[PDB]
């Protein structure tokens, strides 16, 4: 069986989501070959962790997980195992012992607008840290100085979520970079994808 794995919707990726809704998917039992994933457009980051890109296909695994979302262009270097940042504590994060691959590249042609595509938002406040691979759907008002406001979101109490613009007429750091995260596991059944 050398049939195509459904990677088309992963890459061309009709539309996307936000950071907290980091769009978990599940696919398995296909034929994996990343020659399609080879360089085709100007790519700004292909520095992925613990694995040789050459030997991705010869040695194959089970239970592959691949997700994507949007991120501000300046922080793209901040997603690392054991790396600090507000995204690590208040948004989707990654544990230290990470084995998988990752890609980054700017998307200015379709994600730009005369004012900015304000659809994409992010979370700025939580109580404490987050465990790896968790989706937070909290909506209650976050307190700042005790005395909870009970939905007022006024002085001394701030709403946990915020958003930022995507105006094309900016610098490099403000350009929206589409990023895809690759993860997997070893498990104990016969392999599922490679070939």
């Amino acid at each position, epitope marked *: 069986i050398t049939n195509l794995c459904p990677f088309d919707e992963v890459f061309n990726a009709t539309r996307f989501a936000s950071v907290y809704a980091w769009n978990r998917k599940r696919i398995s039992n296909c034929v994996a070959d990343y020659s399609v994933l080879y360089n085709l457009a100007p790519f700004f980051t292909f520095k992925c962790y613990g694995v040789s890109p050459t030997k991705l296909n010869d040695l194959c695994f089970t239970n592959v997980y691949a997700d994507s979302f949007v991120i501000r262009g300046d922080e793209v270097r901040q997603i690392a195992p054991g790396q600090t940042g507000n995204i690590a504590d208040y948004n989707y994060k990654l544990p230290d012992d990470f084995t998988g691959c990752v890609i980054a590249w700017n998307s200015n042609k379709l994600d730009s607008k005369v*004012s900015g595509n304000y*659809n*994409y*938002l992010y979370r700025l406040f939580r109580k404490s840290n987050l465990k790896p691979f968790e989706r937070d759907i909290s*909506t209650e008002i976050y307190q700042a100085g005790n005395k909870p406001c009970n*939905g007022v979101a*006024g002085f001394n109490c701030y709403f946990p979520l915020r*958003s930022y613009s995507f105006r094309p007429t900016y610098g490099v750091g403000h350009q929206p970079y589409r990023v895809v995260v690759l993860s997997f596991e070893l498990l104990h059944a016969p392999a599922t994808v490679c070939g």
Partner: antibody
Amino acid sequence: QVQLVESGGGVVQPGRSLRLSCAASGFTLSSYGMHWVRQAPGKGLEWVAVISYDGSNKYYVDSVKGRFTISRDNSKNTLYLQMNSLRAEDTAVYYCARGWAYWELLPDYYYGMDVWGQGTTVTVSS
Amino acid sequence: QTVVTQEPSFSVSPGGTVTLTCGLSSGSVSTAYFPSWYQQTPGQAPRTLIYGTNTRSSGVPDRFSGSILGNKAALTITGAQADDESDYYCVLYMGRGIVVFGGGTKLTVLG
């Protein structure tokens, strides 16, 4: 393709349950969620209820906790607007809305009113 | 109460530019959640103008526009005409199952 037909309006004594329907044609309402709203005579319209992935959530206003319930019919492609034990506090020409999609962020119910009109009138009186 | 704001009425001559604003009693418009403004027709079915800052709708004339300007969300329309002589509703989404509307702002053209 996006046509809506509704029935079940009328006037009756308070304190008895009423059945009203928002039947849809041209697309499957069971595909994805929608909502609906009421408009008081003269006074400004205000929201009542929203539905979800057709199995996910049953969010209501704070004013109707413990007295309202919503229902759907996937096989016949309609949703039931069950109205139990009419109170004089509710009297409008409320009508159902449209929001189907499948690819978006979910911090809200989103996809507000987009197609309205040609609905049913419900009045409660003693 | 969570009821936000609604101006009583505003005045403008036709053929020019008209703005419209609905502030917040909480004063936090920076929430960046969907601001949506809706037409009204007294006695018949209203329709849509904007769903999300300035995200334009389908089948719409280009003269209408609007965005978060200043600290409080507003609107601005130019080349006004007698197409829609009625009030409008600005809607913000807060509450994870909670919806806020307004009483309407009775825009009246003077020509």
